[PDB]
């Protein structure tokens, strides 16, 4: 029936409705650190989020998205392996039912407790919907989360989860600054890939940061309290909304560092 992360509609079934699931540039992947090639020609990333305008937070039944106003060049990403400017449209997370799993990308097969995705679209395309039809339409910044100390900048998000518990619920969410979610270092790995949920389009340049951010156990616990279901439907906790690693096939992972 419709896709999700259960036994009957989980990632292993997606190819029946979205054949691109078995495509040549699917994500996520395992990052083998010894085989990633250092590329001295890659430039430092440029993150400009000082003018970021968040608007709302929504439970879409598969994760929670914080959405931003992308009608102008307010929060953009440029540099790194990118040509042109990419505007932030939304961020969301993938997490596990246990601390030993939850991330989509893995590093030398290591899984983290969660993974944050900041989604950006190439402004040359004019809108998100046109950008997903292009090979260089999106740029996703992925950041791993490990359990340790609490992340202060994530608390405003944790606190509103109670109000968007079930599928379809949304809440006003203004003045949230995503700079509070960045690690200290911007060193990264990059490779050409796809969206990690249906429609699985191969329109993404992935930028995965080497340095994880720490969150407290209590912070991650509140994520696991969300529901996949809609209000008044039987309760299915929102946990393990991550796609396993896909074959690298003909792609090279490049590193901005050595
Ligand atoms: Mn994602």
Curated annotation (Swiss-Prot):
Enzyme class: lyase
Site (Involved in the binding of some activators, including histamine and L-histidine): residue numbering on this chain: 90
InterPro entries attached to this UniProt entry: CA_dom, CA_dom_sf, Carbonic_anhydrase_a-class, Carbonic_anhydrase_a-class_CS
Family: Belongs to the alpha-carbonic anhydrase family.
Chain residues that bind Zn(2+): 92, 94, 117
Phylogenetic classification of the source organism: Eukaryota, Metazoa, Chordata, Craniata, Vertebrata
Keyword Phosphoprotein in annotation: yes
Noted disease: Osteopetrosis, autosomal recessive 3: A rare genetic disease characterized by abnormally dense bone, due to defective resorption of immature bone. Osteopetrosis occurs in two forms: a severe autosomal recessive form occurring in utero, infancy, or childhood, and a benign autosomal dominant form occurring in adolescence or adulthood. Recessive osteopetrosis commonly manifests in early infancy with macrocephaly, feeding difficulties, evolving blindness and deafness, bone marrow failure, severe anemia, and hepatosplenomegaly.
Binding site for substrate: 196-197
Effect of residue 63 to S: 2-fold decrease in enzyme efficiency, as determined by kcat/KM ratio, and efficiently inhibited by chlorzolamide
Effect of residue 60 to L: Reduced activity
Record text on subunit structure and interactions: Interacts with SLC4A4. Interaction with SLC4A7 regulates SLC4A7 transporter activity. Interacts with SLC26A6 isoform 4 (via C-terminus cytoplasmic domain).
Documented effect of changing residue 140 to H: Impaired activity
Regulation: Activated by X-ray, histamine, L-adrenaline, L- and D-phenylalanine, L- and D-histidine, L-His-OMe and beta-Ala-His (carnosine).
Reported function: Catalyzes the reversible hydration of carbon dioxide. Can also hydrate cyanamide to urea. Stimulates the chloride-bicarbonate exchange activity of SLC26A6. Essential for bone resorption and osteoclast differentiation. Involved in the regulation of fluid secretion into the anterior chamber of the eye. Contributes to intracellular pH regulation in the duodenal upper villous epithelium during proton-coupled peptide absorption.
UniProt cross-references to PROSITE patterns, sorted A to Z: ALPHA_CA_1, ALPHA_CA_2
Organism: Homo sapiens (Human)
Protein name per its UniProtKB record: Carbonic anhydrase 2
Catalyzed reactions: hydrogencarbonate + H(+) = CO2 + H2O; urea = cyanamide + H2O
Effect of residue 60 to V: Reduced activity
Principal localisation: cytoplasm
pH and activity: Optimum pH is 6-8.
Keyword terms, alphabetized: Acetylation, Cell membrane, Cytoplasm, Disease variant, Lyase, Membrane, Metal-binding, Osteopetrosis, Phosphoprotein, Zinc
Co-factor requirement: Zn(2+); Co(2+)
